Chains A and B, each alone.
With several copies, the nearest count.
Chain A
Amino acid sequence: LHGLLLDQYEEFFVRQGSLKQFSLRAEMLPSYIPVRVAEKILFVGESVQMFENQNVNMSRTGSILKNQEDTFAAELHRLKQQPLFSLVDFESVLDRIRSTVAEHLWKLMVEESDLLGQLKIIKDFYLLGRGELFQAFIDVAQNMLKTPPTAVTEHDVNVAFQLSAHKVLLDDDNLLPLLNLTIREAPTSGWAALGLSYKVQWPLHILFTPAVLEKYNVVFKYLLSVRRVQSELQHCWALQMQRKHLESNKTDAIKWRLQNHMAFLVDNLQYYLQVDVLESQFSQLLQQINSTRDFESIRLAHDHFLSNLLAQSFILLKPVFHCLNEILELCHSFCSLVSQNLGPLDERGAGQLDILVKGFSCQSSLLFRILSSVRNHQINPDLAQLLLRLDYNKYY
């Protein structure tokens, strides 16, 4: 109610370990209260404690504007001097202090911070829902992420993102510096190493803790990379647009049979991933927020949201993930094979070709071992339906 954390020598089973820290102590929790009953007392009482900070007119229980706190006082009178202690009598009224109370902070933060606005918007910056307005970035960032990160590159990537979204006309000028991209270090190359920060506000910070902003960044760095290998297969395409660029050499024809295999590749493999990551993960948040006045049912659905994104796009821990990022590395060298001007009529033109036709069948076979395990029953079915769908989509 108050948010009061009382200690005098400290013996409460809730203890202080924004909104402050508070946590369960499980050895100081008695073993006739279950662990799953402890967090109904924790999570209501912390969220009324950060409103004891700011203001009691916002309070989650309600105690000024509403007269529920006297019903809580009655709840207290009955359960204070009960002789024969029970478990059902303890846990039934943990419903009444929570469910009715739990819609009240929900009708606070809809009209205090947006709940419809900000959670598709913060995904348009991470899961990318503004592709052309971010292509303008990939153009400026190609020409300067051929260096590993360094100290001055922190200011360069920022001023670069500033000018790229700005000469385009981003639709709101103040929208522009409530993010910036944050890239000493030498991972390999400056690409797949740049991050992304976003700011946070009041009551939103429990749905967007600084923990989970790493969980959005981690799927971003795989996702910008298959925006990169896609835009490049589109430009290496543009060096082969006409009959004047269609050399009558057979070394050119094996180039032309390659680009029909590889710019068709990323238009399936990286399309059917990427679209299905977004579409029916945005669907299921919107169907909940429109229908459920309760807070924690949306909350843990959005914890299942972010762990499902960083799980579909990170397909299975080791094996499959290594087959896939190696795929986009090997057609990024198919770009550097095409980027020759009068490539195939050269000795090095055919020399470079020969190495890559090996590097490719090291991938078609590596993908093939995944398919035996995909045939083998129940690895992860949604992993196997996606990976076979892009494959029958290479065939038919």
Chain B
Amino acid sequence: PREIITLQLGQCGNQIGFEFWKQLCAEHGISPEGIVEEFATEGTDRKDVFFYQADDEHYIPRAVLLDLEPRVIHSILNSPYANLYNPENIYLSEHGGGAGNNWASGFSQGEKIHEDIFDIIDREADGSDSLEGFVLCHSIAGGTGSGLGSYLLERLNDRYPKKLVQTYSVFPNQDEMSHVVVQPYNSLLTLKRLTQNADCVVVLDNTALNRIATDRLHIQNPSFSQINQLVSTIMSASTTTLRYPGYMNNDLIGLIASLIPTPRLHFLMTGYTPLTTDQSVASVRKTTVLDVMRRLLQPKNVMVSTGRDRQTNHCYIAILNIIQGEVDPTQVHKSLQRIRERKLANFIPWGPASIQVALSRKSPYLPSAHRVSGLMMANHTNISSLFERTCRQYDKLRKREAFLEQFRKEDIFKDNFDELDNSREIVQQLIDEYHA
């Protein structure tokens, strides 16, 4: 089994992982307490490589939902999904915590529910006989999800360090600063852990998110409850090599390893094209495969903020372009030929880059049976642009004298302020030294 145990943590990290499971139930066509169709084995050929294997003809996800506020998990028992999950082997109903908005609460709460936090992942791993890893779906948004998630990057990198560590971080909207004020602190605190307590991550941003939500989803005002729709689908899109047949890189640690050349450059930008429902009327005339990877190499679907004058002094190094559903697997070699003549992907000025192309067959569902799907998993060397945005609001904040002694009460009593600042400066420099 290539069972990955998801570590959903956080007020926002729970919800984006919640519709990740409901999506899998909508396309496998299942009841959340019974397997009522033959689409479970005809549609999908593995259904328990991320789920606990059938012993009642039913599938139980390999997810744990622990959080300081029991209120996000109490909203799972008002939906028919609290018998898809179980009452202690997924989540403990009424597991309290802090206030919680402090990072230093959640960091100390992993150090005293320390016994139970590594029994819940191993209660829910009694059929993993060869573990993939642990993916921490933990949000930076809120002090709840960033505090307890930063603890678990450390204890799972000292017992399972060669196994996958990979987080879906979402840095809260950096154009508010009177909604969240602890925002440069909780970001730089997890960012220290991504580079020496972790292998690879897949970063995201909220302020580059909502750009797309009004351009391809076309909502009237960004609010978190549509943001979770767009995230929950790219999480089921990235595992379509491991839940359906394949061979070359048919593991989730097969895809992600080949997007790393050097530590401190492994931050993957995510892009996903079929969010528009006006491409299902342009498939009666055929949407082609030639141009569906000419909008993946275009920067339009970018969920990580960055300049359009920082891609002329930087080039992409590794870019993976995943088609699902229709593809036509004889003209996919016709699709890559025209890439080099336009040059929509930049190539590193010290050797050839890499365009890895993949295809995968899927279960019947609407962007994998009527219309083309493109997942991008980019690797660009302009990723220091978020780190400069968070580090210039962190030292500015220290110039307003905020959280230098209103943060030293609970388990910070040394100078660790310059520890986040400098380790961020090693990252901002080492990327530029290895990129001309």
Contact with B along A232-264 (1 / 0, CB 8 A): 011001110111111000000000110011011
Task: Give which listed residue, A130, A267, A276, contacts B45 with CB less than 8 A.
Answer: A130
User: Does B311 sit at the interface, judged by CB under 8 A?
Assistant: no
List of B residues within 8 angstroms of A260 by Cβ: 261-262, 351-352
Looking across the interface, which residue of chain A has its beta carbon closest to that of B266?
Answer: A241
CB contact under 8 A between A278 and B355, given known A133-B46, A242-B199, A256-B262: no
> Known: A242-B263, A264-B354. Contact between A136 and B1, CB under 8 A?
yes
Nearest A-chain residue to B254, judged by Cβ:
A234
Q: Mark B91-126, 1 if CB is under 8 A from A, else 0.
A: 000000000000000000000000000000000000
Taking CB atoms, residues of chain B closer than 8 Å to A393 are 336, 353-355
Query: In the complex, what residues of B have CB within 8 A of residue A238's CB?
Result: 162-163, 253
Known: A243-B196, A260-B262, A396-B353. A234 touches B338 (CB 8 A): no
Provide the residues of chain B in CB contact with A233, threshold 8 Å: 257
Which among A131, A257, A263 is the interface contact of B257 at CB below 8 angstroms?
A: A263
Let me know if B359 and A279 touch, CB within 8 A.
yes
Whether, in the assembled complex, B329 has its beta carbon less than 8 Å from a beta carbon of chain A, the answer is yes
* CB contact under 8 A between A242 and B355, given known A135-B251, A280-B330, A389-B336: no
Choose among B1, B197, B258, B263 the residue with the greatest number of A CB atoms under 10 Å from its CB: B258
Mark B1-35 against chain A: 1 for CB-CB distance below 8 A, else 0: 11000000000000000000000000000000000
Which segment of A34-42, A161-169, A197-205, A360-368 sits at the interface?
Answer: A161-169
Given contacts A244-B161, A268-B354, contact A130 B245 (CB under 8 A): yes
**Residues of A63-93 contacting chain B, CB below 8 A:** none
Residue B226 at the chain A interface, CB threshold 8 Å: no
Interface residues of A in 142-187 (CB under 8 A from B): 163, 166-169, 171, 173
A169 to B127, CA, bound (A): 12
B351 A257 Cβ-Cβ under 8 A: yes
A392 on the interface (CB 8 Å rule)? Answer: yes
Determine the distance from Cα of A389 to Cα of B357 in the docked complex, in whole angstroms: 12
Contact with A along B196-234 (1 / 0, CB 8 A): 111100000000000000000000000000000000000
In contact, A242 and B1 (Cβ under 8 angstroms) = no
Partner of A244, one of B196, B250, B254: B196
Cα–Cα, bound, A131→B246 (Å): 6
- The yes or no answer to A139 lying at the interface (CB within 8 A) is yes
A129 contacts B by Cβ under 8 Å: yes
B334 at interface, CB cutoff 8 A: yes
B230-289 CB contacts (< 8 Å) to partner A:
242, 245-251, 253-254, 257-258, 261-264
Q: How far is the CA of A274 from the CA of B247 in the complex (A)?
A: 9
Q: Which residue of A is nearest B262, CB measured?
A: A256
B195 touches A234 (CB 8 A): no
Contacts of B342 in A (CB 8 A): 167
Report how far A375 CA is from B137 CA in the complex, Å. Answer: 51
List the B side residues contacting A49 at CB < 8 Å. Answer: none
* Cα A133 to Cα B242 with chains together (Å): 11
> Is residue A271 within 8 Å, beta carbon to beta carbon, of the partner chain?
yes
B75 within 8 A of A: no
B306 on interface, CB distance cutoff 8 Å: no
Does B341 interact with chain A (Cβ within 8 Å)?
yes
Residue of A whose beta carbon sits closest to that of B288: A173
- CA gap between A129 and B46 in the complex, in Å: 12
Residue of A nearest to B354 (CB): A264
How long is the Cα–Cα vector from A304 to B427 in the complex, in angstroms?
Answer: 55
List A contacts of B351 (CB < 8 A).
Answer: 257, 260-261
A298: CB under 8 A from chain B?
no
CB proximity of B252 to chain A, nearest CB, Å: 10
Least CB distance from A220 to B in Å reads 13
| B355 partner residues in chain A, CB cutoff 8 A | 393, 396
Query: Which residues of B sit under 8 angstroms from A392, Cβ to Cβ?
Result: 340
Q: Indicate which residue in B199, B290, B339, B349 contacts A395 across the interface (CB closer than 8 Å).
A: B349
Does B347 lie at the interface of the complex (its beta carbon under 8 Å from any beta carbon of A)?
yes
Nearest chain A CB to B328 CB, angstrom units: 9
Return B192 CB to nearest CB of chain A, in Å. 12
Contact B250 A267 (CB under 8 A): no
Q: How far is the CB of B253 from chain A (nearest CB, A)?
A: 6
* Alpha-carbon distance A73/B250, docked complex (angstroms): 60
Contact between chains at A242 and B53 (CB < 8 Å):
no
A230–B248 CB distance below 8 A: yes
When distances are taken between beta carbons in the complex, the residues of chain B under 8 Å from A230 are 248, 254
Contact B247 A129 (CB under 8 A): yes
Q: Out of B54, B130, B258, which one reaches A139, CB within 8 Å?
A: B130
- A128 and B247 contacting across the interface, CB-CB below 8 Å: yes
B324-370: which have CB < 8 Å to A? Answer: 329-330, 332-334, 336-342, 347, 349, 351-356, 359
- Cβ–Cβ contact A241 & B162, under 8 A: yes
Known contacts being A167-B341, A267-B354, is A279 close to B251, with CB within 8 Å?
no
Tell me if B352 and A394 are in contact (CB < 8 A): yes
Is B353 a contact of A395 with CB atoms below 8 Å? yes
A206 in contact (CB, < 8 A): no
Q: Is A132 an interface residue (CB 8 A)?
A: yes
A271 and B248 in contact (CB under 8 A), knowing A233-B257, A243-B195?
yes
Q: Is A276 within 8 A of B257, CB to CB?
A: no
> Does A33 sit at the interface, judged by CB under 8 A?
no
Contact A132 B258 (CB under 8 A): no
Indicate whether A371 reaches chain B with its CB closer than 8 angstroms. no
A283 touches B (CB below 8 Å): yes
Cβ of A132 and Cβ of B354 under 8 Å apart? Answer: no
Determine if A357 is an interface residue (Cβ-Cβ < 8 Å): no
CB of A370 to closest CB in B, whole Å = 20
Cα A239 to Cα B332 in complex, Å, equals 34
Contact of B199 with A168 in the complex, beta carbons under 8 Å: no
Among B372-427, those with CB < 8 Å from A are none
Q: How near does chain A come to B430, taking the closest CB pair, in angstroms?
A: 11
B157 contacts the other chain (CB 8 A): yes
Question: Is the Cβ of B356 less than 8 Å from the Cβ of A268?
Answer: yes
Given the complex of chains A and B, what is the CA–CA distance between A321 and B278 in angstroms?
Answer: 47
Is B41 in the interface zone, CB < 8 Å from A?
yes
A–B complex contacts, Cβ < 8 Å, 15 sampled = A130-B245, A132-B49, A135-B2, A166-B337, A173-B334, A233-B257, A241-B162, A246-B263, A260-B351, A268-B354, A268-B356, A271-B248, A278-B247, A389-B336, A394-B353
Closest 5 CB pairs of A and B: A167-B341, A131-B250, A243-B196, A280-B330, A279-B329
12 further contact pairs, Cβ within 8 A, besides A242-B157, A267-B249, A275-B247: A130-B45, A132-B242, A167-B341, A168-B1, A173-B290, A234-B257, A238-B162, A257-B351, A260-B351, A264-B352, A267-B354, A279-B330
